[PDB]
Design a protein around this ligand. Structure first.
Ligand SMILES: [K+]
Ligand SMILES: [K+]
Lengths: 210, 210, 210, 210, 15
């Protein structure tokens, strides 16, 4: 048989069934985590049974995603590894890439621009270390310093360079505010540079799709 | 008559009267909601009379907006349905599109790139689910965890992915701050990719307008 | 005379003196507002004498700025009009445009793209009114509603559309957070449309001057 | 010798050793600042011995960075100068530029675009002064003013112009919120204007290096 | 983006 990869009149209903099952599994995940809540386990078992059935029908990276989606359930049959498997259960969301034409374009854009992504993470790491050390040593003299240590300032440097915002910020001297202004400017610039190459690769793969 | 569709032969008086009545209705809406406050109903009835007269003399999406602008006033003549009709009264603001040549360019841009908006909402959905699950499972081990559940973290993931800012963020461990840094960078990238196609569509329609 | 426009050698030192006097007047302004504080008035009178001497040597918008720079000092020789004149004293900072070759490029960019700036302010007004009405009617049913009225929500809609961040946001229901996410994404899309035309013309003017 | 500046099979060993030593020095910095903490001084002495050996073997700007990386260690062998030297110790992070081909592209982009960087800092200074004085005089009439002085408003104007977010903003009147909305719009426009030439210079150097 | 700040590079929009 092996009609699944092709999209025929009898196959498109199978694709709709797979997309609905994936969305139902994601919903069961986000709902079973809720404080108000066995009945979820039955739906999760049905979803994993459909997943294993599709994988056996197909038995690249999408196959690795199909395997990773099923692995955590079979593992369940210190505490940190249990929380890690409960977290890696989320990877079921990536099976939408099998059906989504646009998500594959994003994956090809990421594979085609790993160097720019590494350059972006490098610039963020350099700016974070620099502005964290600067704001900490600016605050070192004041009594009851806002930043206990340079690593403590990493979160403030990250939220400032990305223009997310640290929220409350008042208990800070003039030098810390000057370093924060420079941090915001430099973070806007460093975020602004690698991005256009990635946007160009995405637009290229997208228009190649059409 | 049929003077309304063309703004010519001294029909500009009718167009300025329509724009003034629309702005007056919007102001009456925003002031009627004020805590300090019958006379507002009189001005609202006058604006509705002008709207229904313009529509009945005029007799596409613009006619649908002209109908929706006047339906809620007549519907008034579960409390949630009352709140919904009071909210849908706002749609009078879209009557300006008939007079604003630039707003129609925005409507043509939104129509030409519906796939772009869908891809953008899809990327935000995937990123919100992923980073919410990550930050929640990172916070699960702490006492008095800041995030009661994955759905509870959806708002934090949205405000971080868009670089709006969650505000206060202290009661969070190192792993949550790491996930938040990754969330800010990934939101930067995910909102940086579909948008330029929409900008190109808007720039093309704007140059076509002149 | 008339060496001021055509800078040469002796006319160059006059330009550096004018720039120093302008910066000194701005510093005297920002220091005169300080809580810790006659001596400031003497430096202000000296800067006003230099400004009036340059203006009388001069005898377009540049002369208008030169007039506005000295008007408040001579007006001083309800309380709200006094606060307004103390505010309009700040316009001395625009005297730098005569010496800053880049600031004139910014002024030509603003004059050459007024239609785009107005279209941007229009889109912001539309989005602010719409999302403010939405978030208010979403919060109306909750006890101790966060938003007393739609106008009260205008500041939240403005900081969300521009992604500045409202700060603490917890006392809000699910519908208000949904409207806030939609407001954030729509704010990305609105501001990011008009802007490229203002860049294109700014870049044109800049490189033409180059 | 001069074995360092080639790509010989022995040379990659020395390159990876220098990169690991630079990263270990940055780590020793960031952990020696920690509240929980001689053993760090031994690793610092080893990193400085390696840096001085690399410098004495090597013997522009790169040599100046290599000098600055080792100067603070030998300086130790008012308190404010001690804080300044402890801060300038961070410059070891810039030794990575010798190995990172992308960091040199960033340095060439900065050297080649000093003029627009100065224009951007100029626009930020102008907008900060203007909006700070505006929000201060708008808030001057309220009892218990949120802004004690125009300089006190500089941090708010900076975080708003860059859309980082001041945090809580409620104790402010209508006029201050209006000035804040204008500040957010103008800051987005003034930040966006000079970036694109910097991005174009960066992509030019990145493709010339390709 | 918001402050992702795309620098265009879509052929300047071809206009
Ligand atoms: K932002
Ligand atoms: K923000």
């Amino acid at each position: 048989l092996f009609e699944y990869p092709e999209s025929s009149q009898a196959a498109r209903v199978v694709a709709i069934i797979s997309v609905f099952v994936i969305l139902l599994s994601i919903v069961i995940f986000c709902l079973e985590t809720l404080p108000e809540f066995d009945p979820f386990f039955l739906i999760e078992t049905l979803c994993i049974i459909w997943f294993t059935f599709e994988l056996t029908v197909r038995f690249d990276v999408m196959n690795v995603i199909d395997i990773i989606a099923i692995i955590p359930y079979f593992i369940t049959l210190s505490l940190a590894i249990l929380r890690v498997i409960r977290l890696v259960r989320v990877f079921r969301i990536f099976k939408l890439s099998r059906h989504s034409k646009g998500l594959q374009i994003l994956g090809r854009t990421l594979k085609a621009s790993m160097r720019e992504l590494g350059l972006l993470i490098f610039f963020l790491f350099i700016g974070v270390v620099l502005f964290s050390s600067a704001v900490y040593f600016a605050e070192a003299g004041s009594e009851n310093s806002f930043f206990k240590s340079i690593p403590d300032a990493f979160w403030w440097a990250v939220v400032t360079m990305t223009t997310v915002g640290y929220g409350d910020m008042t208990p800070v001297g003039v030098w810390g505010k000057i370093v924060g202004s420079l941090c915001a400017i430099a973070g806007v610039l460093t975020i602004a540079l690698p991005v256009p190459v990635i946007v160009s690769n995405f637009n290229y793969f997208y228009h190649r799709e059409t």
